[PDB]
Amino acid sequence: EFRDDACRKEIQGFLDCAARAQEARKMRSIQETLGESGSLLPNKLNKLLQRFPNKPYLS
Amino acid sequence: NVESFASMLRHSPLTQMGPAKDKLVIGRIFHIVENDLYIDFGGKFHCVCRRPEVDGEKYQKGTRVRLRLLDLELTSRFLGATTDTTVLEANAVLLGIQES
């Protein structure tokens, strides 16, 4: 009947999950994007590509 | 008695090697950047090899090392290109240090 005293354990479980989700989302958006984890970033990949541009013409 | 260019080409060590794939050669380290070793083995282009972790201290300028050549020049023609894309370097696998 929507009494918080009888549901203390379950309330804390959801409250903890929100804290983890908020922290992970901020870390993923900032640290993971800046950390360049996994594949090379497109900004750095484009610099390498323009060093060897594709030439469909004759020079 | 003047040696012609065809005579020079025929007897040159590079020509008599044949295909460069899986051939053991001796190169000289001339430029070092961090752990990247630039080794010249007498070919047109040099090769870049990572500094081995086992004995990386010995690899210095002028040190002679053993290489297994895989390609004298790295080129490949991609989609829509009128010419091959050249890396201006050779492909080789570093094995050890040449010792006499």
From Swiss-Prot, chain A:
<dbReference type="GO" id="GO:0005743">
    <property type="term" value="C:mitochondrial inner membrane"/>
</dbReference>
<comment type="similarity">
    <text>Belongs to the mitochondrion-specific ribosomal protein mS37 family.</text>
</comment>
<dbReference type="GO" id="GO:0001650">
    <property type="term" value="C:fibrillar center"/>
</dbReference>
<keyword id="KW-0539">Nucleus</keyword>
<dbReference type="GO" id="GO:0005763">
    <property type="term" value="C:mitochondrial small ribosomal subunit"/>
</dbReference>
<dbReference type="GO" id="GO:0032543">
    <property type="term" value="P:mitochondrial translation"/>
</dbReference>
<dbReference type="GO" id="GO:0005739">
    <property type="term" value="C:mitochondrion"/>
</dbReference>
<dbReference type="GO" id="GO:0003723">
    <property type="term" value="F:RNA binding"/>
</dbReference>
<dbReference type="GO" id="GO:0005654">
    <property type="term" value="C:nucleoplasm"/>
</dbReference>
<protein>
    <recommendedName>
        <fullName>Small ribosomal subunit protein mS37</fullName>
    </recommendedName>
</protein>
<comment type="subunit">
    <text>Component of the mitochondrial small ribosomal subunit (mt-SSU). Mature mammalian 55S mitochondrial ribosomes consist of a small (28S) and a large (39S) subunit. The 28S small subunit contains a 12S ribosomal RNA (12S mt-rRNA) and 30 different proteins. The 39S large subunit contains a 16S rRNA (16S mt-rRNA), a copy of mitochondrial valine transfer RNA (mt-tRNA(Val)), which plays an integral structural role, and 52 different proteins.</text>
</comment>
<dbReference type="GO" id="GO:0005829">
    <property type="term" value="C:cytosol"/>
</dbReference>
<keyword id="KW-0689">Ribosomal protein</keyword>
<feature type="short sequence motif" description="Cx9C motif 2">
    <location>
        <begin position="7"/>
        <end position="17"/>
    </location>
</feature>
<keyword id="KW-0496">Mitochondrion</keyword>
<keyword id="KW-0687">Ribonucleoprotein</keyword>
<keyword id="KW-1015">Disulfide bond</keyword>
Swiss-Prot record, chain B:
<keyword id="KW-0225">Disease variant</keyword>
<keyword id="KW-0597">Phosphoprotein</keyword>
<comment type="similarity">
    <text>Belongs to the bacterial ribosomal protein bS1 family.</text>
</comment>
<dbReference type="GO" id="GO:0005763">
    <property type="term" value="C:mitochondrial small ribosomal subunit"/>
</dbReference>
<dbReference type="GO" id="GO:0005743">
    <property type="term" value="C:mitochondrial inner membrane"/>
</dbReference>
<keyword id="KW-0687">Ribonucleoprotein</keyword>
<keyword id="KW-0809">Transit peptide</keyword>
<comment type="subunit">
    <text>Component of the mitochondrial small ribosomal subunit (mt-SSU). Mature mammalian 55S mitochondrial ribosomes consist of a small (28S) and a large (39S) subunit. The 28S small subunit contains a 12S ribosomal RNA (12S mt-rRNA) and 30 different proteins. The 39S large subunit contains a 16S rRNA (16S mt-rRNA), a copy of mitochondrial valine transfer RNA (mt-tRNA(Val)), which plays an integral structural role, and 52 different proteins.</text>
</comment>
<keyword id="KW-0689">Ribosomal protein</keyword>
<dbReference type="GO" id="GO:0005739">
    <property type="term" value="C:mitochondrion"/>
</dbReference>
<dbReference type="GO" id="GO:0032543">
    <property type="term" value="P:mitochondrial translation"/>
</dbReference>
<feature type="modified residue" description="N6-acetyllysine">
    <location>
        <position position="58"/>
    </location>
</feature>
<keyword id="KW-0496">Mitochondrion</keyword>
<keyword id="KW-1274">Primary mitochondrial disease</keyword>
<protein>
    <recommendedName>
        <fullName>Small ribosomal subunit protein bS1m</fullName>
    </recommendedName>
</protein>
<keyword id="KW-0007">Acetylation</keyword>
<dbReference type="GO" id="GO:0003723">
    <property type="term" value="F:RNA binding"/>
</dbReference>
